[PDB]
RNA sequence: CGCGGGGGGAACCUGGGGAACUGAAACAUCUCAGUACCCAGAGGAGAGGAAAGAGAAAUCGACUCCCUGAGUAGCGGCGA
RNA sequence: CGAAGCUGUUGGGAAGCAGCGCCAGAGAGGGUGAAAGCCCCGUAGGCGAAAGGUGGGGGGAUAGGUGAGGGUACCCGAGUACCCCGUGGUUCGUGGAGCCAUGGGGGAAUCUGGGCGGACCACCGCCUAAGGCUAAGUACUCCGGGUGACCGAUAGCGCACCAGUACCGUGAGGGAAAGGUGAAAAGAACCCCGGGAGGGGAGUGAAAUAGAGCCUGAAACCGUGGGCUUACAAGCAGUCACGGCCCCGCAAGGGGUUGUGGCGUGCCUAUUGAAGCAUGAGCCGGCGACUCACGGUCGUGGGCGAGCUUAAGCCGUUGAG
RNA sequence: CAGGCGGUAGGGGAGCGUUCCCGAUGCCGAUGAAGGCCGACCCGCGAGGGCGGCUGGAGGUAAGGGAAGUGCGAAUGCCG
């Protein structure tokens, strides 16, 4: 196009606001009976309630609050067969994931649903579904080791 | 394009079975173009703002006016509001649109006729009226307004003041003026970027 | 300034992938009874049928 | 304001972008740029005393600051200031020209 | 006798002394803070710096400035 | 060094138009008697720095520094680490609380030695303090410069007119209003009223409703002069009905303003509740208050879409990327 | 054509003026822009907008969309 009435594809609106006037809703606020407003405003998150805010509960998860850190066990994860059914070449735990989808892993656990093309995909921990899908129906690897 | 060596060209590769989405074209283009403008706006108030003389007259009574903090809620230069503030909000994006945009435009500007040369000789790639010999012997003249890219520093100290056109060097994006204009030329299909 | 999720709440509760507010009620932990004969058991973990789906928000940065 | 204008008396000549005619300029100073070369129509209606020419008022004057000037061109078009590599008295000694170094 | 050095300089350095209000919709533990201020030597840099480290890896490799890690790990009427 | 024409005609004045000439790695701007590239300073570009001197890089580079393998065999940073309590910090309010300084006493060792992987013994792994130096890559700003979706001087820096001055204060210190003739003062000569003042003709003058509390100059306020109006009278005061009186429209009617009369409880708050002797409003001008940062949420035009986005940097950037 | 129609808060729809952007090496303008006194014509439902005279004496900004210290009777507000 050019410089002609570029009116921003239909719905555009800057939807600002304003101080006030004498045309309608404008120049009011809205409330009073409930005393909100503060030069240094409440916040305003959910601090209200003034009733233990349904927080008369208790901490159950005991997997935190120590001092240095938490538990540390190399990327524990999984997988499905329908996500890469695509091609193969070799289906290497880095050919894929190291390049593409999913992050790190010392322990790759295989699984899912589907029923695609199986063949010697390297793994560090399998699921039995794969086992029967590759017991005269496909090929498999070994595991970590170091 | 020429007559000296070749005589023929043209292409709509990019993606011709589409090239029809003006909607998004509008929105984004406009936004970045703004950005740049050195935004260094001031602010005055907060608590003290240049340590104020330290309060004044009492209250209950005072000089008739329940109020007495030299925050200065009246002086023309005292305790107001933070409209500006240095950060003039710096937002931007990638080539996802750098390409797509220049495409439909020029492609449509080709539905009007643009030109493309890619590489040539105008003369002593320096003098104003040398390239003039390339204005009336090329075809172009006062009206439609044109733009062109050539990365040789020769053309740089040559095009100097470009009344009617652009004159570029590296890799910018001045569709701006071209939007309100037309005519063009490029530096190799390579420079447009593969 | 960046807003930091409440570890407290995160130190206890869980949201079921689809916006739900559930955790283990309040009564059977230790069992303030003593006598020993009925009740002791009978309980699990529910949600909050009104405003909790609003609370979840302050925990959408850690999950 | 950069303290930088033009020549002096010697010869000089006015133009006619406000008055008319021409003359050998009289006393062009420097500071605010100003100067008055005999011509133009001016005179102050000063106080009537004996110290002055007697009657109140005065006489001669001009006034201006930026451009609006010219030099010596009886027949030829109009140039400005020439050059050299090894010519006249040492290498300098100019005074406006027709076509050479002097005229 | 020699140089110092007192003394001055707008922020910005380092360090040494170093509060309270306001929050928690009371308040004493926590907050603002090691902020504000006061003192001190200092240089355009200062200050900091060459490993008696990190931290789990058959590892990295002076100290400093930004980027993220994570606002997670955790401190905590683990409440704010 | 700096680039590159005028001329005529109306026009106060030409930077007004036209018929055509022009330089241009220099058509950034600033200005000259009315909205100029070619007209004063400049603007791309490059000459260049000193004698004075003076701040520093590359170059060169001087005193100051730089081999190894094996057997003998003693020596290497203390009231120090290591205990403890009283610990500050570290995210760490003692908590299972390790590591640095330790304040207080106790108190070793020297390489088959000595600190640590957050208590303590058993395997493993990195370092050698108790002497100290050490630039860069970093912070900051009066002021130099640019530029500012910086403001245009009741803004703004507190103040651009001599203010940190008037003034106040005991001190400490507190702290002010006040920009603007014109293009050029070219600034009123002279005579008449006359105390100097202030006036008037007249003059310089495009304009003195341009003249010195001088740009253009409104509002609260101030009447000379003008028209409609008033002494039988009950009034939030304006209204509308008709009608009347002086203005323009040939006309049809358009004004102004009231005569009688029907009509007439105002307002901004506050609130089961108002017209309101329950608040506030001396009056006009001007100044006056929910933006923004970053973060979060749910919508929206949207691109791509199992894919979808890159932080700070290195180059490039008048400017862009 | 049935319909609807006071409506404080409130939450929806549009628009209205008003200062800085680019369109501005574009265009109106001393055969007046900005300001202002007058209007009892032309459009807006209004928000406002035009247009014409007169005073007034150097700048202004299309359509357009881009930003928003703005939409000001007062607050014994602040100033003159």
From Swiss-Prot, chain A:
Biological processes, Gene Ontology terms: translation
InterPro entries: Ribosomal_uL15, Ribosomal_uL15/eL18, Ribosomal_uL15/eL18_sf, Ribosomal_uL15_bac-type, Ribosomal_uL15_CS
Region of interest: Disordered: 1-56
Signal peptide: none
GO MF annotations, alphabetized: rRNA binding; structural constituent of ribosome
Cross-referenced Pfam families: Ribosomal_L27A
Biased composition (Basic and acidic residues): 40-49
Keyword rRNA-binding: yes
GO annotation, cellular component aspect: cytosolic large ribosomal subunit
Keyword hit for Phosphoprotein: no
Key words, A-Z: Ribonucleoprotein, Ribosomal protein, RNA-binding, rRNA-binding
Record-linked SUPFAM superfamilies: Ribosomal proteins L15p and L18e
Family the entry assigns: Belongs to the universal ribosomal protein uL15 family.
Subunit structure as annotated in this protein's UniProt entry: Part of the 50S ribosomal subunit.
Alphabetical list of HAMAP family matching this protein: Ribosomal_uL15
Free-text function comment from the UniProt entry: Binds to the 23S rRNA.
Annotated protein name in UniProt: Large ribosomal subunit protein uL15
Organism annotation: Thermus thermophilus (strain ATCC BAA-163 / DSM 7039 / HB27)
Phylogenetic lineage: Bacteria, Thermotogati, Deinococcota, Deinococci, Thermales
Chain's gene name: rplO
UniProtKB/Swiss-Prot annotation, chain B:
Keyword rRNA-binding belongs to the record: yes
Domain of life: Bacteria
GO terms of biological process kind: translation
Keywords, ordered alphabetically: Ribonucleoprotein, Ribosomal protein, RNA-binding, rRNA-binding
Role, per record: One of the primary rRNA binding proteins, this protein initially binds near the 5'-end of the 23S rRNA. It is important during the early stages of 50S assembly. It makes multiple contacts with different domains of the 23S rRNA in the assembled 50S subunit and ribosome. Forms part of the polypeptide exit tunnel.
HAMAP family reported in the protein's UniProt record: Ribosomal_uL4_B
Protein name: Large ribosomal subunit protein uL4
Organism field: Thermus thermophilus (strain ATCC BAA-163 / DSM 7039 / HB27)
Name of the gene: rplD
Curated annotation (Swiss-Prot), chain C:
Molecular function as annotated in GO: structural constituent of ribosome
Keywords: Ribonucleoprotein, Ribosomal protein
Gene3D superfamilies: 4.10.410.60
Gene: rpmI
Pfam families documented for this protein: Ribosomal_L35p
Name of protein: Large ribosomal subunit protein bL35
Disulfide-bond pairs as recorded: none
PANTHER family assigned to the protein according to its UniProt record, in alphabetical order: 54S RIBOSOMAL PROTEIN BL35M (PTHR33343), LARGE RIBOSOMAL SUBUNIT PROTEIN BL35M (PTHR33343:SF1)
Family membership noted in the UniProt record: Belongs to the bacterial ribosomal protein bL35 family.
GO BP: any one term: translation
One CC-aspect GO term: cytosolic large ribosomal subunit
InterPro entries: Ribosomal_bL35 (IPR001706), Ribosomal_bL35-like (IPR021137), Ribosomal_bL35_CS (IPR018265), Ribosomal_bL35_sf (IPR037229)
Source taxon at top rank: Bacteria
Curated annotation (Swiss-Prot), chain D:
Chain ranges passing through the membrane: none
Database matches in NCBIfam families: rplX_bact
GO MF term set: rRNA binding; structural constituent of ribosome
Coiled-coil residues: none
A GO biological-process term: translation
Lineage of source species: Bacteria, Thermotogati, Deinococcota, Deinococci, Thermales
Quaternary context: Part of the 50S ribosomal subunit.
Presence of keyword rRNA-binding: yes
Gene Ontology CC annotations of this record: ribonucleoprotein complex; ribosome
CDD domains: KOW_RPL26 (cd06089)
Pfam families, per the entry: KOW, ribosomal_L24
InterPro entries: KOW, Rib_uL2_dom2, Ribosomal_uL24, Ribosomal_uL24_CS, Ribosomal_uL24_KOW, Translation_prot_SH3-like_sf
Family membership: Belongs to the universal ribosomal protein uL24 family.
Name of the protein described by the UniProt record: Large ribosomal subunit protein uL24
Domain of life, source organism: Bacteria
Entry keywords, A to Z: Ribonucleoprotein, Ribosomal protein, RNA-binding, rRNA-binding
Task performed by this protein: One of two assembly initiator proteins, it binds directly to the 5'-end of the 23S rRNA, where it nucleates assembly of the 50S subunit.
HAMAP family: Ribosomal_uL24_B
């Amino acid at each position: 196009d050019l410089r002609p009435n570029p009116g921003a594809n239909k719905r555009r609106k800057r939807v600002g606001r304003g101080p006030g006037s004498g045309h309608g809703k404008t120049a009011t606020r809205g409330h009073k009976g409930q005393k909100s407003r503060s030069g240094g405003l409440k916040d305003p998150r959910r601090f209200e309630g003034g009733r233990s805010t349904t927080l008369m509960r208790l901490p159950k998860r005991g997997m935190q609050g120590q001092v240095p850190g938490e538990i540390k066990r190399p990327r524990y994860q999984g997988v499905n067969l329908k996500d890469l059914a695509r091609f193969e070449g070799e289906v290497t735990p880095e050919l894929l994931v190291r390049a593409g989808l999913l992050k790190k892993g010392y322990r790759l656990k295989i699984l899912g649903e589907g029923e695609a093309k199986p063949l010697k995909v390297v793994a560090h921990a399998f699921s039995k579904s794969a086992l029967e899908k590759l017991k005269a129906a496909g090929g498999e690897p070994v595991l970590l080791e170091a | 394009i020429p007559v000296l060596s070749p005589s023929g060209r043209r292409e709509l590769a990019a993606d011709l079975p589409a090239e029809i989405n003006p909607h998004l074209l509008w929105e984004v283009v406009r936004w970045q173009l703004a950005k740049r403008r050195r935004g260094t706006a001031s602010t005055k108030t907060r608590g003290e703002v240049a340590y104020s003389g330290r309060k004044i007259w009492p209250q209950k009574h005072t000089g008739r006016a329940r109020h007495g903090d030299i925050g200065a809620p009246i002086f023309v230069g005292g305790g107001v509001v933070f409209g500006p503030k240095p950060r003039d909000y710096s937002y931007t994006l990638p080539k996802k649109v750098r390409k797509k945009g220049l495409a439909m435009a020029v492609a449509d500007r080709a539905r009007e006729g643009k030109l493309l040369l890619v590489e040539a000789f105008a003369g002593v790639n320096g003098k104003t009226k040398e390239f003039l010999a390339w204005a009336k012997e090329a075809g172009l003249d006062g009206s439609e307004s044109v733009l062109l890219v050539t990365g040789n520093e020769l053309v740089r100290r040559a095009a100097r003041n470009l009344p009617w056109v652009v004159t570029l060097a590296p890799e910018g994006l001045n569709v701006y003026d071209i939007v309100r204009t037309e005519r063009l030329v490029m530096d190799l299909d390579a420079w447009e970027v593969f | 300034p960046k807003m930091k999720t409440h570890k407290g709440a995160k130190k206890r509760v869980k949201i079921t992938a689809s916006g739900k507010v559930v955790a283990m009620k309040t009564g059977k932990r230790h069992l303030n009874w003593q006598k020993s004969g009925k009740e002791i058991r009978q309980k699990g973990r529910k949600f909050v049928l009104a405003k909790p789906e609003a609370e979840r928000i302050k925990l959408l940065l850690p999950y | 304001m950069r303290v930088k204008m033009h020549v002096k008396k010697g010869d000089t000549v006015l133009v006619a972008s406000g008055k008319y005619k021409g003359r050998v300029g009289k006393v062009k100073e420097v500071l605010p740029k100003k100067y008055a070369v005999i011509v133009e129509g001016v005179n102050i209606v000063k106080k009537a005393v004996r110290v002055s020419p007697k009657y109140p008022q005065g006489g001669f004057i001009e006034k201006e600051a930026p451009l609006h000037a010219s030099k010596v061109r009886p027949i030829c078009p109009a140039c400005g200031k020439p050059t050299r590599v090894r010519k006249k008295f040492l290498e300098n000694g100019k005074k406006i020209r027709v076509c050479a170094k002097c005229g």
